[PDB]
Amino acid sequence: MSLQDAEWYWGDISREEVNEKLRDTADGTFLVRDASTKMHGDYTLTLRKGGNNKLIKIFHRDGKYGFSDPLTFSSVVELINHYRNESLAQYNPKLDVKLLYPVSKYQQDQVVKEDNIEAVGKKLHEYNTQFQEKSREYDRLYEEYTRTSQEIQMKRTAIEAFNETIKIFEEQCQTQERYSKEYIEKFKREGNEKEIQRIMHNYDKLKSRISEIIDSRRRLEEDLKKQAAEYREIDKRMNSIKPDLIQLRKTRDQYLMWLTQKGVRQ
Amino acid sequence: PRPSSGELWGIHLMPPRILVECLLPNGMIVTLECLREATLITIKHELFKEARKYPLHQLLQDESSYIFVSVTQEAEREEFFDETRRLCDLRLFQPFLKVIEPVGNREEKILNREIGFAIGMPVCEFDMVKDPEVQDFRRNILNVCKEAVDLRDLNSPHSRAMYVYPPNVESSPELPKHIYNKLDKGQIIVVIWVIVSPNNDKQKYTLKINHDCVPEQVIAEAIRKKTRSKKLSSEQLKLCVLEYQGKYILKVCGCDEYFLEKYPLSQYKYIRSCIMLGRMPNLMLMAKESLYSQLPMDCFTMPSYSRRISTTSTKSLWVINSALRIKILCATYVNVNIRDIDKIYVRTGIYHGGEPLCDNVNTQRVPCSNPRWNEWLNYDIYIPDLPRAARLCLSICSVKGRKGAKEEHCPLAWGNINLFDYTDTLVSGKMALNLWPVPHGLEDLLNPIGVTGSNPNKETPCLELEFDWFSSVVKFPDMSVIEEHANWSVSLRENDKEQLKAISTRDPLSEITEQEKDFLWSHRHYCVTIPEILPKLLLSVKWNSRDEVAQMYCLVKDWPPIKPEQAMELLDCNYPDPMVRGFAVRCLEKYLTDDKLSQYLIQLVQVLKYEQYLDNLLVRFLLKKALTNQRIGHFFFWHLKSEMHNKTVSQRFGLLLESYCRACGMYLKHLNRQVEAMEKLINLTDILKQEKKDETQKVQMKFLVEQMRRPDFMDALQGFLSPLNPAHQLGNLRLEECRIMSSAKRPLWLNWENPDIMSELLFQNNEIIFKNGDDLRQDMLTLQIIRIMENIWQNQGLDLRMLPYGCLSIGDCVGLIEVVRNSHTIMQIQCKGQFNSHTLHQWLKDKNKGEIYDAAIDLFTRSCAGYCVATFILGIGDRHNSNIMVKDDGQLFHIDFGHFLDHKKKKFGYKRERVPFVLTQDFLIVISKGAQECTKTREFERFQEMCYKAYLAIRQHANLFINLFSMMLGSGMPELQSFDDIAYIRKTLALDKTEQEALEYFMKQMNDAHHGGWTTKMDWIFHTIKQH
């Protein structure tokens, strides 16, 4: 019946801390906290509605409490339950949702079940240690991911450049063929044999050139294939550790909060 | 990890001689050995000599009939019309050249190659784009180009000079008192220099004039002093002055900064600085004609794509009687570890800005190996209630549920889509969307701040969607239709008036309760009396009801403009509505000075990423300004260019850069010299960081020295404008002063002669650090904020000397940094004192002997106060003796910021506002001039009040800084990703407290961090002066 022992009353936590807690949760989810002004009497109800967190001020005058102007309560606990059962159209007749899921202090703190401040401190040290380590790994992976992404792009652009190059050398061949044929017919008809072979020799040179360029592109295509495989594996490994790294951080943050709580305060 | 973008594919530098394959028009191939620096004129000539020794030689025409074509590293076929370019500068993919007869529109081809070079991308890539929005942008933006170039050449040659050499001025002529009092009864001493023919001797005139004087009056006084001896009739004098007054113009000695406009002299930034610093202004007088003669004629040409031909049941959105329905079909693949993930699903949401318009909707969960849903997702919104800027935001997510009932969700790839396209068409039918990688640091399942549209890279997860059809093209309704509907939707006060006011004075991220929203909305007509409540009124609006939005439209139509400082909020990611943003641009159009636009350019460019469409009012406004003021254009260009590697914006920034380069006039050749300079420096440092990384410094200096002496390097790295400040001309390199710095990324310290004829008076040295390897965007942003802080303080008569040195990001982890001369780290100082607490003060004493000692103390103290306050507010990464510096004249400043806001909370968990810059006893001893008891001196008390004033002044301008940070959320800075990141400065500025509580809080932070010493000359009850 007292405000302090209420499971959904969270004291001096920030807007942001509430955003995290109400993030992606269902309509009707709520909690109450101190106002962001810290005016020692004012509290703020935060209610989940339509994918959005609503801030509802709890107005505290004489001995009473009220959403709206008619101050018709005496404790904050009264008010929350009065809406927790009935509809919220009493506040404002538009889109009443009441108050159905409370974010409770109590399921949170079961996560930390160590008795003494020393047990907590020690596990905080382990978790923090694991976290800075696994942060470092994930940062390292992201740099590799980024470098690998860039190189794959360079290589794609280089393959296009090969394609254009090969086309041009293939055009030279066709050009040489359009022309030379009407000359081979004539250098034979006029006795010259060495001049014929100089034509053939330039054609052989062009042909082998095109073949080296085509192989070079072939090799780059192969490297592109390999690196494309590395890239997806780098992506898999980041997808694997992301959610674990997030969880671990929240666990570390939880022990740290727990330590704070069972330490001296001022 | 060794691929290279140097002089050839796979090779940073060509060897001194190289074999080049030449493809003749008769089919023959000639291999020619070429000098790597030979021009195409030489090579062509050598080729056609050699080609005589090959068969079918008679089919070849005069060599003059031909040019070279080849493939570039951007895989373009480039025709080399400028045959003076060097082989090593061609950016060949491979060493070959093809001989062709030049065809086509030569001048257009040449200009498109110059544009392509400037922007880092061939403009032919644009011609291939199928997207109607893209081609429409390219054509339609040309109107802004024509309007600018016309407006430029109108009042020639003066209107052209104003474009090239805009006045560098403060935003008001009003002098703060600490500035005015440094004058001599409102008058300044100025030195006017003239270069006299025929020996170009320098003659000096020292004048004493009102700070008020317009340049023409300064010239008038100069004429008076010059014709002092040659005494005449006063009427002929007054008329002599009158006739020749407008025959000259004034220039800052040492840099390309002119006074072409009738602002009062003290309003010019150089002059205002000279007053503040007690420095002699040195100006150079020259004939108007000798400037107007330099000025290039800028001609704008309509491009080809503006000369091409591009090939009934239209239902109002509002008469579509259905709920919103979207179908998720299938996705090509995800990259997950099948052993680590239980299922995948697609998450979706319909958004207006960052706010969901209804609840998010997930598809069902399916196996990793088979991403297929075939699911109609139903959204709690009526199609006619869809606001104009509504977007679908989605992601493919993995889910793992291996511990208890707890599960872990991870986004794998995300995508956003406009529900209406740029023509107001409601999307319908099938769509395939290539998704994007999740940004580092982002943990939310959706990424609504992210850009809209398909990933151009098509080797990525591809999601097939389908939107509903209504057997007709559906369009958002006309403004006439909306306006009419508002009318038919609409058919104690002293407390209320004073409460609205109170709501309006709160910062942009201030919590607004549901009560306050309903209150705002219900008094919406009264809100026009306090026009700056508009942002809060807008956020009270229910954007999922057409009824409310229609009414909100009728209000912003007639809304009185509000100050730029507040209108900019309406351009961040929380206000996507095209009417709302139009209003914002209209405010900028009427009230934003060129000076403030330059000051906030970084942010204004960034919010372009938030725009739904390529064509919008904001981009037309920015491009216009960029094309009518070259100092804006320069930084406009460089901020866009520096991001061209980021595929999320390279299309939009590329199209925008194309139209800028097409109309910017001759300055495109200056920008092309800058880009080629930067490209050479990138290549040189790439070699040092890659090939030569396991080599000593001495060997690396040898290589650097020989490289910079090459003709192709000399050509490109001499005689261009500094990208940090294009008023600074970079002349000849001073090779003996150039060096590779010791740090790991291998920065280059470069030094250029200043070819300004009066460089001895100002900037004899132009020194820059080029750095390839670090992301410099956070330093650039932090230095910018410091600059704005300093400017706020100055304007309030608070002289806290900051040092926001130049830092410019010019591409992907590459940038320029201004060199601050005569400056040393604290560590270096203690290392040249063995050192006690007093070493710093002693260092300072020796550098400022005698009468100038007090000046150094004062300057140290003021600069110290500015950085103490700025770092506290911004949460700069903790200071130490290596990132804090002092000049010989005692000015203190900070470097290497690279960490801010609540970055540390996210890493260590500790919920605290640090005091980054803790003043140790070393510093206290300086401020107190060596006193035994430093905190009890009058000087320390003076230093304190400086801090208090500085702090409150930034707090009073909280809107500006919150808005500036808010405009950066979409930037790609891990530290600046959500509004929750900006919460940190709301804390340090104590914005949810009263001003007096805020100052109390600041004093408490300093005390906690310094372990005592920070006292109040106020009583604790009324904060009224209790002493002296």
Residue numbers in the entry:
A (entry chain B): 326 to 591
B (entry chain A): 3 to 313, 322 to 501, 523 to 864, 871 to 1065
Give verbatim lines from the article:
Class IA PI3Ks signal downstream of tyrosine kinases, G protein-coupled receptors and small GTPases to regulate cell metabolism, growth, proliferation and migration. They consist of a p110α, β or δ catalytic subunit and a p85 regulatory subunit (further referred to as PI3Kα, PI3Kβ and PI3Kδ), with a broad tissue distribution (p110α, p110β) or enriched in leukocytes (p110δ). PI3Kα phosphorylates PIP2 in the plasma membrane to PtdIns(3,4,5)P3 (or PIP3), which can be converted by 5-phosphatases to PtdIns(3,4)P2. Here we report on the discovery of UCL-TRO-1938 (further referred to as 1938), a small molecule activator of the PI3Kα isoform, a critical effector of growth factor signalling.
Class IA PI3K activation upon binding to phosphorylated tyrosine motifs in proteins occurs through the release of inhibitory interactions between p85 and p110, by: (1) release of p85α-nSH2 and p85α-iSH2 from the p110α-helical and p110α-C2 domains, respectively; (2) movement of the N-terminal p85-binding domain in p110α relative to the rest of the catalytic subunit and (3) interaction of the p110α kinase domain with the lipid membrane.
